[PDB]
Symmetry: D2
Subunit: 455 residues, 4 copies
C-alpha cells in the first residue's frame, strides 16, 4: 500500500503552532484569503508544490560548490550534460523558472496567426502563446473534463481532435503541439506513452513540431511504470528518456520535479532555433550559461533531476498524495478523481451544497480549513476564474475546488493525517460553513489580493 | 492520539534501500555484530540517540556564524548565557561531549576511597568515578530493575537506601550523589521532582553534594509535566529550571537533549571548584572558552537547548517513542515497561525464552532485526556486560531501539514495528551465536559471531 | 594610502594554477574569445562584477533561513522593509535580476513613440526601452565620452541638453528620464547629488518622471561622500536615501551593489503603477511575493544591501579598484580616467595604436592578457558594439577589468597589474584577429577568431 | 619573492572596526590582557593558528554530507583512508583535537619511570608524558636555544645527546623519542629529513620507538622542499610520506595543518597498541569511528589534509608569514630569527629595553599593539612562564616575546601591512610604552585570566 519515506530527515524547519483562536484572528487579518496569510503563521502549507520542495544533503553540498562565474561555469556544464543524458535533447538553455522558458519558446516557434494545440492549458503557458499571436485549441480527450470519472491517463491527446484541426486549418497554420505531462488543470492527470507515440507519428507526417511541458514529467513517468502495460521492467530514467524521444523540445519548471526551490530550462534539438534561443535569453533571463540562475542553483537542479529518477522517491511522492486522497474518499469527502501526482482536489461544490457559487464556497472552505487545522490550501474556483471584463460578470467554472498541493519531501503521513482528520471533522458539520462576500476586489488577478467577510 | 511532527522537513538524508539478500550478506560480512555494520548499508539506524539528531534551520544558521576564535568567542558567550538562564547554574565549562565533563567532575569531587551513590550507573560515568578511586553504590528503587513492572518514575532514588548508606559509611566518606535524568540503564525512566526535592533535603543535612547527569533532562521534564500532579500548568523551561535548583552542578551531553551532533558541558555553582575546572579543562579538552568544540558547535548547542524547551517538540519526541512501544506491545512483543523517553527496549529474555543466555539471545535478535528490516539496534545484555571473572549476567537482557531526535517518522516506526512483529511470530527460528573474537575489554564493540 | 580589507576571509574558493603553456592551449581552444573560456581554467576572473560577489557569513546564515513559501514569505518582508528603509520608496517588486525589472518598467511607463533620455545607456536597459517603442536620447555631458579627461562626476546629465529636448520634442512625448548611478558605459563614473537635484527640479516643472538605474548606487554614494562638498559628515545610508528622494522609482540589479550572486527588484512610489507591476510580474518573473527568487536569495539580498551601507566596506571596494588603476597609470599604461567604482578600463585604442580598429585590438588585448597571466577581461569595443549596417565604431575601444566585490586581494591586483605592465612593454607584439564566426546578433558572446 | 593567494575569497567574516579610543576602553576592560579581549572587538586576531583556519568550498560541501552515525560512518572511512594514503600509517584513531591524542599515546607507550626525549617540548604534550610517570629529556641541538642565530633546520635532534642518553640510562628505560615537526617552542623551526633518518637509524638499533608530533608537519615539509638539497623535485605529499616512514606513529592536531577548526587523530603501525588504543579512546573521546568528532568534521579534516598537500597553498602560507617578518626586520624591529612556519616572534626584551622583565614588557607590548592597530597577539614571556610554586617567585625565561600567529587562509598581505605598520610606528616611539603591575593574579595559569594596570 503506502511505503515509508525512502530517506531520513537531515534538518527540520521551525513552525509556529498557534492555536485555533489565534488562527482565526490571522485569517480575519488576511480577509479570509489564504493567499494573504503570512508563511510564519502556517503549520502545513499546501498552497503549491512549486519551489517548496526540500532539498537533499547532496544538493546542499552542491550549494556550497557554486561556480558563480558569468560565463563557462562548471555548474552549467553539470546541468547541461545531465539534461542531455536524462532527457536526450541536444541543446539546453537555463531559465530562472518555467514561465521564463515558455516566454522564450512562444517567441521562437509562433508566427502571428498560427494555432497552438495541446492537452488542456496552463495560465502562464497559454498567456505567452496568446501574447505572441497564437490561438489555443484544446485537443485533450473529452473524458478529461469529467471530474468524477476514475480512469487512467486522462491527459491523453484525442487523436480525432488533432486530425480534424490539421484538416480544418492546415499544417502550415499550426505552430506546434504543446503536450503537458502531467496535466495540471485536469488534476495532475498523466499521459500514456502510447499517446505520445501516436502524437509524434501524426505530427511528423505533416512536419508539425511537438514541444512538451515537462514540469511534472517524473510523476508522469511513474504513472506509466505503474499503470501502462509493458513498462513494468523499465526504470524511471528509461521511461523519461523515451518520453522525450517523441518531442522536439520542452519547457521545464525545475521548481517541481527537479526537487529545487528555483530554476527551469528550455530544451530543443534544432540547431537554428537554439542559436536564436541564446540570442533571446540574454534579453529576459541572462547569459546562456546561467540564464537568470546562480551557479549553485544550476548545480542543485542538476543533482535534483538525477535524484528524481530514483524509483523509491517518486513512488513515495505519488503514494503520499494518494494516501491523503484515499483517506478522504473512505470517509465520504467529495474529491476530484482520480488523484493526481501532486495534489488532492476537494469538490467544494458538493462539500458546500448549502452555498451558491456566488457565495464563494471554495474560498470559504479554504478559510475554514486553515482556522481548524493550520493548513493552507488554494482556492481553485470562481475567485480564481476572474471576471470577463467585457461584461463584468463572474467567470463560472464547472470545477469549484480547493487544491491541497503537496511539496516534495517536506511532509509526512502524520501531516497528511492532520489535513485529512481536520477536513473530515469539518465535513461532518459542513452545514456550519458560511458564505463570503467581497469587501475588497482588485482589477486583475483577484485570487491573490481580494478580501472577504462572512455573510 | 499521537501528534504529528511539530516541524517541517527542511532537508533530507540519502539512504540505501538494499534488499534482504544484500542485508544478509552485509550482516555476515559484519559477523552478526551490529556495532560493525557500515552506516551506508543501514536504512533506519537505531543504534543510539547520541549525536544522531537532526538540527534545525536556526541551528544551521548558527553554524554559518561560527566565531572560531581561541578566546572570547561570541558563540561561547551565547552558550554560557543560555545555560545560566535555563539551568540556573553559576558557572559553565564546555566539553567536547558528556564523558569529557565526567572526567573533569570525577577528578574534582572524588577523594580516593570515597563512595559515589546514584540511581543506577552508566558505563562512562562509572568508569571515571572508579578510575578516580570511588566505589559505586546503587541506591535506585528496586522496582527499576524489573523490566516488566509498569510504574511511573522508575528512576527515583530510594530514600531508605540513601539513609542506610549515610549511616553505614558516614557522610564524610560519600563524595557526592549522582542523580541521572533520565535513567538510561533502566530504559529511559524519569525521576520525579518530589524525589529530587527529597534527595536535596537529605543530602544537605549532612553536607553531601549532589551532581546531576542531565543528559536527558528535557525528556525527564516532560514526564513531570505529564504525570506528576501540580506541574500541569508549568512550562518545560520552568520544570527544567526547578530540577537543577536541587543540584550543586551537572554533567551534560549535548549530543542528546541539546539536539546537536557533538558537544557537552559541565556546570557548577561553587567558585573554587570552577577555578579548578578551568585549570583541568586545558589538559584534556581545551581552553575554557571553547573546551574542545568549534565555535559553530557551541552556537548550535546553545540554540538546540532553547529549542528543546518547546512543549510541542518534546511531547512529539516522547510520544513517537511511545508509539513504537505501544504498537509492539499491542501485538504481544515483550518490551521493557514503561516506555522511556528515548528508546524502546525489547526484552530478549522473553523474546528468546527458548534460547539460553550463553547463546547471546540479544545479540542474535539484533542481527536478525537488521537482516529482516535493515534496522540497526544495540545489544544491551551479557555482551555489553562483558566478563570480569572467567560471563556477567545482568537481570536485563535487552535489545535497544534508540530513536534519534527529529530524524524519523511514524512510517519509519511502522517499518521497525511490522518487521519485529513478523520476527516475533517466528521467534523459534532465531538461533544462537558463538564467540569468534576474544572479549578484549569492551567486547560489544568488536566481537564477531557465527552459527551456520 | 589604500586600506586593508575591512573583513576576514571566512571560506576560500579553489582555483586552478595552470601554467602559461596550458593557458595558451585553453585560449586557442576558446578561439581567442574570453567569453568562451571555461571558469575552471581561469585564475582571476575579471569578466564582470555582476553576480560574482562573495557573500558574508551573515548572508550565508540567512541562506539557511530560506522561507520558500509561494506567498507571505518572511524573506520577502525582510527585503521589502529593508528597501523601504534604505531607499525610501513606497513599493517594492522583486525580480530575478536587473533586466527583469527593466522589462517591467519599460512596459509600464513607455507609450509607443515617446522619448527616453538618460546619461548614456546600457545594452539591456536600452533594448527594453526600444522594444516598447521608445527612442533613446543621450543627454550626458560631452566630457563623459572622453576616456582620458580626468574630471569628477563624469556621469552628470547636461541640463542644457535636457532643456533642449523638452523644447524640441515637448514634455508630453518624453516617457521618463533614466538616470543611471553609476554610469557603466563611461567607466563607472558617478553622478553628483547636485545634478540629481537639478534634474528633479527641471523634470518636475514639466511633469516628466524620473527613474533611476540604481545598479551601482552605493559606489555612487561613496564618490559623493569623498568628492562632493557638504557630504563629508553624512553617512553612506543618508546619501543613498537622499539620492532616491529625487526619483519616482528605480530598477535595481542586486547582483552588483547588494553583494549577492542573483537578484534584483523594481521600486516606485505610485500606487497605480505598482498595481500594474504586480499584474505583469506574474507573467515573466513570478508572484509579487518572490518574483523569480528563492526565499533564501531575497534574504541574502536584504542583508547584503544593509552591509553595503558600511563605510569601510565601500571605501575599500572603490580604493581596491583605484589601486589597480593607479599602479597601471604609474607605469604608463593607458586607461580610462578617472577610475570608476567597479572596473578599470584599458584604452585599447592607445594600448594598440599600431593596430587598426578592424583588427579587433581590444579583443586581441583581452586574449593576450589571459595567456600571459590567467586573467579574464571583457572586450568593450567594436565587437561588443556589433554591426547594424554592413562595423559600428564607438569612440571608446576598451578592455574592462571588472572587479567582483570582496573576492580578490591587493596581491591579486598586483598579478593583474604586473602582467599587463609587462604586456605593455611589448605591445608591438600584440597581433590582430580575424573573424571566424558570423556576427549573428550579439557577436561578442560567441564569435571566434584567429591570426596564426 | 611573495606569491599572491592561490585561491579566491568565497565568503567573508564580519568584523567591527572600532576606533583607537574605543579599543583602549576595551583593553582596559580586559585588564590589559589580550587573552581577556572579546573576539567581536578584534580586527586581526593573531592569538593562535590553532583551529582558526578558513575552510574551502570543498570542505564546506563535505560539511553538508556529515554521516553522523555512531559507528561505521562514511566520513571516518574517508578520513582513515586519507591518512593511510598520505601518512602511510597502518591504523588511525580520531580524537577531538591534538591533546586528546597525546593523552592516549602517553597512557599507551609510557611505563612509570621511563624517559621521554624530544626536540624541545610543548606544554600539553609534556604534561601528559609527565602525568604518566615519564621524565622529559631535551635532546634538541644547542643552536635551537639561540634566538638570533639564523640557521636552517634549528629543530634537528642532536644525535650526540641521544647517544649519551641511551648509554647513561639504557634503552629499556626510554619510552620513546617524541620528534615534533615543526618545533613550536623554538619559533616554528623545521626538522630536516636527514635528521629524521638518523634518529630512526639510531633508535631502531636499540628497539626504541619514535612517535612524531605532526601538528605542523606540512609546514615542515615545505621547508624541506625549499631548503634541503635533493628534495627540489619531490612533491609535498612525497615529502610528507617519507617523513612518517621514519616513525612508528604520530599525534596530530588537525586544527593546524589540516585546515580545520576542530579535530585530531592518533596514528600507529603496531596492531597490539592499536587494539589498546581503541579500548582507551572510548573512555575519553568516543568510539574509534568518530573519536569525539562529528561526522562532518572528520570529512572536513580529511579534505583539508589533502588540500594542504598543494604546493601553492603551503608556499603562500609560509611566505605570508615570512613577509611579515621581513617587513619588520627591514625596519629594524627586533624579532626571533629565523621566521618560523606559522608565526613571527617580536623580541619584547629589545623592543622594551627601558622596562625590566618584572614589569612584563611582552604583556605591555601586546596591549599597546591592540590599542594602536586592533591586532591581538599572544604574550610569550614571564607571564606565560608562571610561578615556581615551591618558592613563589617568577619563572624567568630567556625569551620575552610577543607571538604574532597567522591562521591559514584567513588574512591577506594588506592585513600583514596593518600589523607591520602599526608595530613599526610603535617601535619609533617605543620609549613611551609603560610597564604593567598585577592587580589580579590567579593561582594557576595566569596568562589566561590575570589583570594588570599601568605603573
Ligand atoms: C503545468 C505547468 C505548471 O504547473 C506551472 C506552474 N505551476 C505552479 C505555479 C503557479 C503558476 C501560476 C499561478 O497563477 C499560480 F498560482 C501558481 C502551481 O501552483 O500550479 C508552470 C509555470 O512554471 P514556473 O512557475 O516555474 O514559471 C508551467 N506549467
Ligand atoms: C546517561 C548518560 C549517557 O547515556 C551517555 C552516553 N550515551 C550513549 C552513548 C554511548 C556511550 C558509551 C557506550 O558504551 C555506548 F555504547 C554508547 C548511549 O548510547 O546511550 C553519557 C556519555 O555521554 P557522551 O557519549 O556524550 O560522552 C553520559 N550519561
Ligand atoms: C548599469 C546596468 C548594468 O551594468 C547591468 C548589467 N551589468 C552587467 C552584466 C551584463 C549585462 C549585459 C551584457 O551584455 C553583458 F555583457 C554583461 C555588466 O557586466 O556590467 C544591468 C542589467 O542587470 P542584470 O545583469 O542584473 O540583468 C542594468 N544596468
Ligand atoms: C606543537 C604542538 C602544538 O603547537 C599544540 C597546540 N598549539 C596551539 C594551541 C595551544 C595549546 C596550549 C596553550 O597553552 C595555548 F595557549 C595554545 C598554540 O597556540 O601554539 C598541540 C596541542 O594540540 P590541540 O591544541 O589540538 O590539543 C600539540 N603540539
Ligand atoms: K552568479
Ligand atoms: K576553533
Ligand atoms: K521557493
Ligand atoms: K554524530
Amino acid at each position: 500500500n503506502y511505503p515509508a519515506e525512502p530517506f531520513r530527515i537531515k534538518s527540520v524547519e521551525t513552525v509556529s503552532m498557534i492555536p485555533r483562536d489565534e488562527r482565526l484572528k490571522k485569517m480575519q487579518e488576511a480577509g479570509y484569503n489564504t493567499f494573504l496569510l503570512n508563511s510564519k503563521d502556517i503549520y502545513i502549507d499546501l498552497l503549491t508544490d512549486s519551489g517548496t520542495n526540500a532539498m537533499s544533503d547532496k544538493q546542499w553540498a552542491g550549494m556550497m560548490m557554486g561556480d558563480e562565474a558569468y560565463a563557462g561555469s562548471e555548474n552549467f556544464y553539470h546541468l547541461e550534460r545531465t539534461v542531455q543524458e536524462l532527457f536526450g535533447f541536444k541543446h539546453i538553455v537555463p531559465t530562472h523558472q518555467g514561465r521564463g522558458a515558455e516566454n522564450l519558446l512562444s517567441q521562437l516557434a509562433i508566427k502571428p496567426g498560427q494555432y497552438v494545440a495541446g492537452n488542456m492549458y496552463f495560465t502562464t503557458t497559454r498567456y505567452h502563446q496568446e501574447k505572441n499571436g497564437a490561438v489555443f485549441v484544446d485537443i485533450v480527450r473529452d473524458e478529461a473534463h469529467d471530474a468524477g470519472l476514475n480512469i487512467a491517463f486522462k491527459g491523453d491527446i484525442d487523436l480525432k481532435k488533432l486530425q480534424k484541426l490539421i484538416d480544418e486549418k492546415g499544417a502550415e497554420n499550426i505552430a506546434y503541439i504543446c503536450l503537458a505531462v502531467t496535466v495540471n488543470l485536469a488534476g495532475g492527470q498523466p499521459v500514456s506513452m502510447a499517446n505520445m507515440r501516436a502524437v509524434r507519428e501524426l505530427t511528423a507526417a505533416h512536419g508539425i513540431k511537438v514541444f512538451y511541458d515537462a514540469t511534472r514529467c517524473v510523476e508522469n513517468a511513474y504513472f506509466i511504470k505503474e499503470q501502462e502495460q509493458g513498462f513494468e521492467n523499465k526504470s524511471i530514467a528509461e521511461i523519461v528518456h523515451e518520453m522525450f524521444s517523441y518531442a522536439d523540445g520542452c519547457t521545464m519548471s525545475g521548481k517541481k520535479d527537479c526537487l529545487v526551490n528555483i530554476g527551469g530550462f528550455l530544451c530543443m534539438n534544432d540547431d537554428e532555433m537554439f542559436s536564436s534561443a541564446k540570442e533571446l535569453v540574454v534579453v529576459y533571463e541572462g547569459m546562456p550559461s546561467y540564464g537568470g540562475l546562480a551557479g549553485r542553483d544550476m548545480e542543485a537542479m542538476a543533482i535534483g533531476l538525477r535524484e528524481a529518477m530514483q524509483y523509491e522517491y517518486i513512488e513515495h511522492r505519488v503514494k503520499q498524495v494518494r494516501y491523503l486522497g484515499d483517506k478522504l474518499k473512505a470517509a465520504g469527502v467529495p474529491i476530484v478523481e482520480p488523484v493526481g501526482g501532486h495534489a488532492v482536489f476537494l469538490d467544494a461544490r458538493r462539500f458546500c451544497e448549502h452555498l451558491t457559487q456566488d457565495e464563494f464556497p471554495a474560498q470559504s472552505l479554504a478559510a475554514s480549513i486553515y482556522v481548524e487545522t493550520g493548513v493552507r490550501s488554494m482556492e481553485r474556483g470562481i475567485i480564481s476564474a476572474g471576471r470577463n471584463n467585457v461584461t463584468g460578470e463572474h467567470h463560472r467554472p464547472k470545477l469549484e475546488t480547493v487544491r491541497l498541493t503537496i511539496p516534495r519531501r517536506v511532509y509526512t503521513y502524520a501531516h497528511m493525517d492532520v489535513v485529512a482528520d481536520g477536513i473530515i471533522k469539518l465535513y461532518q458539520h459542513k452545514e456550519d460553513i458560511r458564505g463570503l462576500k467581497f469587501i475588497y476586489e482588485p482589477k486583475q488577478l483577484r485570487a491573490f489580493t481580494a478580501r472577504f467577510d462572512y455573510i
